[PDB]
C-alpha cells in the first residue's frame, strides 16, 4: 500500500538558528533536528515514551541509574556506525564546566555517563528526577563523536556542523540552507527504520502568515499551520485537507522583572486585570482557542482539574485602583501614570510573521492606554528575538510569546530562580517558596502525589503573575488530501514524517 515518492514543502513563519539539541531553544530549530538526528526515545502522539534508537532501557537503583542498550547497525549520514561512543560523547557535553548552552536543566541530574560496551551505556544520576527518563532521552539528538569529539566544548555551538554541515542518523539528510528562504532535506536511503517514503522535505521560511496562506492556495507550499481566522478560506483550497486539535502550548505575555516597571507583583496582577483576554480571543482568534489561567496545557495529565486559581478577570476600574495602591498615578496631566520620576512606558515585542501576536500586541497597547500605560509595539524577526530573550541578553521589557511545552510536566525549567542565569527563566521570576516546592516535587514518584503537590505550585505562579497567560492555541494543519500515514501530534508538527506518503 504505501507508495514511495513526492516532495513536501512545509511553510514556517520562523527561521531556525542551528541544529543541535544541546544549544537550541526554539521550535523551528527543533523541527529540523527531529528530521536530521536520532534520539534514544520518542514521545508518541498519546504522549507515551517509546524506544527509538534504544533497544532497551532498564531503570536501576530506584531511578538513580539507567542501563541503555543501543540498536546495532544504525548509520550516520556519512556511512559510519553509530555506537555508545556517540551517546557518551553527546550527553557528556552539558556536564562539562565549559558548556555554554541554555539546556543545563535537562542534564543537571546526571552524575556521569559511562560506556559499558560498543552498544551499551550506563547513566548515573546524582538524585532522582523524572525529567531524565521522560525528557532528556527524547530531547537529546545523538551527535557523531568521530566528527565533533575533539572540538573544544567552549566552541561547540559556533561550529559549522550546527548550521551547514550537520551529520546525523535521522530519516532525512541535509542538502541546503539558503538563508532567509529555505532548508532542503533529502530522504536518507540508509535510515535504520527504512527510508522515508517522501523524497524531500523543504522547510520554507515565510515570515508573513498571510503570504504563507497565499502560497498554500497556489501550491507553492503544501503543508502549513493555518491561522484560525483563515480556516474557512483555506478549507476551500484545492488538493488539501485540514487536521485540527489542541496544541501542547500556551501563549503569554512575559513581563521582564529586570525592568523596574514589572518588579511589583501587584503591578503585574493589575496588568492582567486591565486586559480583556476573552475579547482578545474573540477578536483576534475568531473565538478559536480558550483563555489560559494555568502554566500547563489541558492535554497534560498534570493539568489541575479541580483547582481554583486566582484568575484576575478583566476589570478596568479595579486595575486603575490596584495601580494607584501600588504608587502609580498621573502627576503631570499627560494621561500616563507616573511614579518616583518615572513614566509607565515600555516596548512590547513579538515575532515577525505571526499576525495573531502582532494583533494581540496592538490590542494590549490600546487596552493599557485606557489606564494610562504607554506601550510601543515592536515586531522582530524570529531568530533575532530568540537571541534577544535568551541569556546573556534578556533584551526586552515585555513580549508576546509562546511555549511548546514539555511532554513531562515540570515547571522548574521555566520558573525556578536557578534558571535565570543560564536557562529559560527569561523574565527573572523568583519566589523562594515556589522554588522549594518545584525542587522538592522532583523526588515524588507517584503521579497522584506529584499532581497534588503541583496544585500548590500552580497557585503560587498564578498569584505571582510572572506572565499574563493569554490562551491555549489550536493547530490547524493543512496537508495534501492524498497524504496518508499522518497522525496528529500536539507538540511535533512533523512527527514521524518518514512514515507519511502520498497516495497515487
Amino acid at each position: 500500500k504505501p507508495q514511495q515518492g513526492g516532495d513536501l514543502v512545509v511553510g514556517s513563519i520562523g527561521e531556525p538558528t542551528l541544529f543541535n539539541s544541546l544549544y537550541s531553544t526554539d521550535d523551528a530549530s527543533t523541527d529540523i533536528e527531529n528530521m536530521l538526528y536520532s534520539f534514544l526515545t520518542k514521545t508518541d502522539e498519546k504522549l507515551n515514551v517509546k524506544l527509538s534508537l534504544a533497544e532497551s532501557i532498564k531503570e536501576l537503583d530506584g531511578g538513580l541509574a539507567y542501563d541503555v542498550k543501543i540498536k546495532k547497525g544504525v548509520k550516520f549520514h556519512d556511512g559510519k556506525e553509530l555506537t555508545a561512543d556517540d551517546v557518551v560523547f553527546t550527553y557528556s557535553v552539558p556536564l562539562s564546566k565549559d558548556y555554554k548552552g541554555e539546556r543545563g536543566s535537562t542534564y543537571e541530574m546526571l552524575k556521569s555517563v559511562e560506556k559499558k560496551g560498543d552498544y551499551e551505556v550506563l547513566f548515573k544520576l546524582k538524585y532522582k528526577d523524572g525529567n531524565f527518563y521522560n525528557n532528556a532521552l527524547d530531547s537529546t539528538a545523538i551527535l557523531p563523536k568521530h566528527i565533533l569529539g575533539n572540538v573544544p566544548i567552549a566552541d561547540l555551538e559556533e561550529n559549522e556542523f550546527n548550521r551547514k554541515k550537520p551529520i546525523g542518523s535521522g530519516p532525512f539528510k541535509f542538502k541546503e540552507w539558503k538563508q532567509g528562504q529555505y532548508i532542503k532535506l533529502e530522504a536518507n536511503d540508509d535510515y535504520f527504520e527504512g527510508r522515508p517514503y517522501l523524497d524531500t522535505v523543504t522547510y520554507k521560511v515565510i515570515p508573513d502568515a498571510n503570504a504563507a496562506e497565499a502560497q498554500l492556495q497556489a501550491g507553492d507550499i503544501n503543508f502549513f499551520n493555518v491561522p484560525a481566522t483563515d480556516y474557512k478560506t483555506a478549507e476551500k483550497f484545492n488538493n488539501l485537507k485540514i487536521v485540527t486539535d489542541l496544541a501542547l502550548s500556551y501563549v503569554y505575555i512575559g513581563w521582564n522583572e529586570k525592568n523596574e516597571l514589572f518588579k511589583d507583583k501587584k503591578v503585574r496582577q493589575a496588568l492582567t486585570t486591565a486586559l480583556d483576554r476573552e475579547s482578545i480571543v474573540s477578536q483576534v482568534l475568531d473565538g478559536d482557542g480558550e483563555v489560559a489561567y494555568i502554566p500547563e496545557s489541558p492535554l497534560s495529565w498534570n493539568y489541575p482539574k479541580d483547582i481554583d486559581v486566582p484568575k484576575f478577570e478583566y476589570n478596568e476600574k479595579k486595575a486603575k485602583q490596584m495601580l494607584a495602591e501600588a504608587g502609580w498615578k498621573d502627576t503631570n496631566g499627560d494621561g500616563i501614570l507616573d511614579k518616583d520620576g518615572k513614566k509607565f512606558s515600555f516596548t512590547l515585542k513579538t515575532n515577525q510573521g505571526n499576525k495573531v501576536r502582532e494583533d494581540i500586541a496592538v490590542v494590549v497597547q490600546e487596552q493599557l492606554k485606557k489606564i494610562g500605560i504607554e506601550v510601543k509595539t515592536q515586531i522582530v524577526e524570529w531568530s533575532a528575538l530568540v537571541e534577544q530573550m535568551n541569556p546573556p541578553n534578556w533584551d526586552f521589557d515585555a513580549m508576546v510569546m509562546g511555549w511548546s511545552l514539555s511532554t513531562f510536566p515540570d515547571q522548574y525549567d521555566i520558573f525556578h530562580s536557578s534558571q535565570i542565569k543560564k536557562g529559560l527563566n527569561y523574565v527573572w521570576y523568583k519566589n523562594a517558596e515556589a522554588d522549594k516546592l518545584m525542587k522538592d516535587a522532583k523526588s515524588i514518584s507517584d503521579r497522584k502525589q506529584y499532581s497534588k503537590e503541583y496544585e500548590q505550585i500552580y497557585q503560587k505562579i498564578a498569584e505571582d503573575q510572572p506572565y499574563t497567560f493569554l490562551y491555549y492555541p489550536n493547530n490547524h494543519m493543512a496537508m495534501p488530501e492524498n497524504l496518508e500515514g499522518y497522525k496528529y501530534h500536539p507538540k511535533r508538527d512533523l512527527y514521524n514524517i518518514e512514515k507519511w506518503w502520498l497516495a497515487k
Partner: peptide, 9 residues
C-alpha cells in the same frame, strides 16, 4: 521532550 520557544499561535 523539553520546552521550546514557539513561533506559531
Amino acid at each position: 521532550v523539553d520546552s521550546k520557544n514557539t513561533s506559531s499561535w
